[PDB]
């Protein structure tokens, strides 16, 4: 569920509370919580 995305290598993934901060394939420790697919509603004004 909780998805994660790599720095610039565009690796998409998901860490759990069992592993350190490390992009699984690129070996990049600057990872980013992948955005929520959930819709956000706006007022357009």
């Amino acid at each position: 569920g909780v998805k994660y995305t790599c720095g610039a290598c565009a690796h998409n993934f998901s860490l759990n509370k069992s592993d350190p901060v490390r992009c699984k394939e690129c070996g990049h420790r600057v990872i980013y919580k992948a955005r929520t697919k959930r819709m956000i509603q706006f007022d357009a004004r």
């Binding site: 509370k17 069992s18 592993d19 350190p20």
Partner: protein, 315 residues
Amino acid sequence: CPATVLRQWCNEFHRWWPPLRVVILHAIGESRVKELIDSVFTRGHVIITTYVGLRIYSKHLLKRDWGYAILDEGHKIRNPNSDISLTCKQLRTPNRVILSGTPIQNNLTELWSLFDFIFPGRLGTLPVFQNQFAIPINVGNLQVQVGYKCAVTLKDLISPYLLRRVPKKSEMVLFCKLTAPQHALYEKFLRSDELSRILQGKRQVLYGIDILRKICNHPDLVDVHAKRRSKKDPTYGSASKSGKMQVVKKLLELWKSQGHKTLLFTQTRQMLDILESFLERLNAKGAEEEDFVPFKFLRMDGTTSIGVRQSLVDV
């Protein structure tokens, strides 16, 4: 006697000399122990005690007089100034015998403290014992001959106070090197504020040599998340990073197919997790392929119960 030989010690009484009565220091052999005290001196002949149990009922034991004294523990007395002397050397009897073939393992201070229990000080006080020959033995001509006589005097003074009696073995010691990731973590910890802070005095060197041994066993043990990934992260163990896995993999597999029951020896239960993940991965590799045999390890420690012991020791 220790708690691992309590029933044993009562057993030889029962078998060799039934006429000798015996009473262990437990619920059987706060008033109940006092009715136990009733006729434990006239009717009771020999009293048994675990060397943790004296300070459970010492209120009514150290008071009355005693005869012959036996202590089957020569490594839980060691040097003076401990709870040992507090509950032991206050006994009232010349007869004092210790049953242990390894009394001297750390220093002659342990020798003096062990001689104190048997004899009232045929040598002298602790300051006297030290100032006599402590430094000369350590430093040592200018030392040898005078030291030789000062030591043979001690040998003749204590020799009639402790008896002394004594396949093949191969001792191969392998000198492996620190790996590059190991050398990096070694230099990083080597040049840090905490080491100097320990040296100056606010902390103890015991916590700085435990962490530099923590890195020699393998790199992945100096991590702050040790418990959080010990048994739930199958990358915590790894291999070839410790500088000793290769001389472990090769050396253990040279006996795995050779069928040689071998002993793997550690000191920490934390490194057991790493060597256990490693051997489970070895098991997985062997089971996936063929013409092999399961590694079949087991781990024993203080975490387990006193009941298990012999069972695994037997299996």
